[PDB]
Write a protein that binds this DNA or RNA. Structure first.
Length: 435
DNA sequence: TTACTGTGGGAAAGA
DNA sequence: AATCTTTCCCACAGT
């Protein structure tokens, strides 16, 4: 009972946007630890967006299967470090069905944890439990690195900033928490919110040397160094900033020392963004308004910038989970959402198989090819394998359209993992029969 | 006004 | 050694 039905799968694939429940968590890849009683909060604040109409259908299927205090069809969310429930802080609250940010999380030196992740649990007012979802991995740091050179081993994965990764940028007035503001596009224009922040892909531009100049030979490691032309695009909506140059700051002074360029930018470093031309102007903040700014020289290797033009930069990550209760509205939470990493196809002939590598797989999942459910063998929460269904049976007239590449004319079916009580999880992957 | 509190900078210690 | 990380200490400007 409740096992997903081919027709019901088709209703869903053809209405993915409308039906699909999407939950996304954003946070920084690193977090400074708190010593003693102090509390050094995670900035930007981890937040969650419940995207898609799918959530409203769910609200109803709730409100109605409810009337069987008043309005207990509301969301109650909780977030915490790892699995412990001591510091389970309660979460506040276009096609954004709901949002929320944890603004006062912190991690104590008493926690021997060296890496960690955040766990957000959701429920309806009536106490109905939707599920728990984890953030991506977070490394703990003692303080922003004062490295002046670049190291080899140092897991740059967490301390350096790679050329196409995303970052948050925030301003803060004279060490005052309630003054923090995060760069954020609102109304296709840049601003500085106090509760929201955007992730910006940071594009690195190689240096136009060449020719006559034959001094160095390279520095091309992909990372972002000081004195670098960088373009910041808002990962959410194409909007971008004028290819600015990143300079390291130190107490209202933008150091230009002819050596700074050997220093890779790092997690939580303070910095400023000067114009390519007028290397005397900097991206500045003013009453939650992004304006350019004039800076006095105060030296040839220095500058005098106001607090409004100094930003703390930090690398950012995202975790997305997608689900749909295709058949009824299950009694169990969705909680362990399987995540598919890659789909491997080994062994050919008639015994051709597909290996699915991911996380949180469970024995109650069958892999589907479009609307064709195959035989699924569970290896481990990180491994599943099945057989490819015969092209011929992977689609009919009712579905010819959707599973055929209008161009190449080939069969391409979306891969989903369906849980025995009818919950569908888009893999995000596509199996083309080109085989 | 007094008590308490994130934050950024510095000292001292550890590596 | 010389430099960076970790831990402590603390004053600034705010609730």
């Amino acid at each position: 009972v409740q096992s997903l039905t081919s027709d019901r799968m088709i209703d869903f694939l053809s209405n993915k946007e409308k039906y699909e429940c999407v939950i996304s968590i954003f946070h920084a890849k690193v977090a400074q630890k708190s010593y003693g009683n102090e509390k050094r909060f995670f900035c930007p604040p981890p937040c969650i967006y419940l995207i898609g109409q799918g959530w409203k259908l769910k609200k109803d299927r709730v409100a109605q299967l409810y009337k069987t205090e008043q309005q207990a069809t509301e969301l109650v969310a909780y977030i915490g470090i790892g699995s412990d429930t001591s510091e389970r802080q309660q979460l506040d609250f276009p096609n954004i069905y709901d949002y929320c940010a944890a603004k006062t999380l912190y991690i104590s030196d008493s926690d021997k944890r060296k890496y960690f992740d955040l766990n957000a649990q959701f429920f309806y007012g009536c106490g109905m439990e939707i599920g728990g979802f984890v953030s991506q991995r977070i490394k703990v740091i003692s303080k922003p690195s004062k490295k002046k050179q670049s190291m080899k081993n140092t897991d740059c994965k967490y301390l350096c900033i790679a050329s196409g990764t995303k970052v948050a940028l925030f301003n803060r007035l004279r060490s005052q928490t309630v003054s923090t503001r995060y760069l954020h596009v609102e109304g296709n224009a840049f601003h500085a919110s106090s509760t929201k922040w955007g992730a910006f892909t940071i594009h690195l531009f190689d240096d136009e040397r060449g020719l006559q100049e034959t001094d160095n030979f390279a520095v091309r490691d992909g990372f972002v160094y000081y004195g670098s032309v960088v373009k910041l695009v808002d990962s959410v909506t194409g909007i971008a900033l004028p290819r600015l140059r990143i300079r390291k700051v130190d107490k209202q002074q933008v150091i230009l020392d002819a050596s700074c360029s050997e220093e890779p930018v790092s997690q939580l470093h303070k910095c400023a963004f000067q114009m390519i031309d007028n290397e005397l102007v900097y991206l500045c903040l003013s009453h939650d308004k992004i304006i350019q700014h004039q800076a006095t020289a105060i030296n040839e290797h220095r500058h005098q910038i106001n607090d409004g033009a100094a930003w703390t930069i930090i690398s950012t990550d995202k975790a997305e989970y997608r689900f749909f209760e295709a058949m009824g509205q299950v009694a169990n939470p969705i909680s362990p959402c399987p995540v598919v990493g890659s789909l491997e196809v080994d062994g050919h002939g008639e015994a051709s198989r597909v290996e699915l590598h991911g996380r949180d797989f469970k024995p109650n999942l069958k892999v589907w090819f479009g609307a064709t459910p195959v035989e699924t063998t569970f290896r481990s929460e990180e491994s599943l394998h099945c057989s490819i269904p015969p092209v011929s049976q992977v689609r009919n007239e009712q579905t010819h359209w959707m599973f055929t590449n209008r161009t190449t004319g080939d069969v391409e079916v979306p891969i989903s993992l369906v849980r025995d009580d009818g919950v569908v999880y888009s893999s995000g992957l596509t199996f083309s029969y080109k085989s």
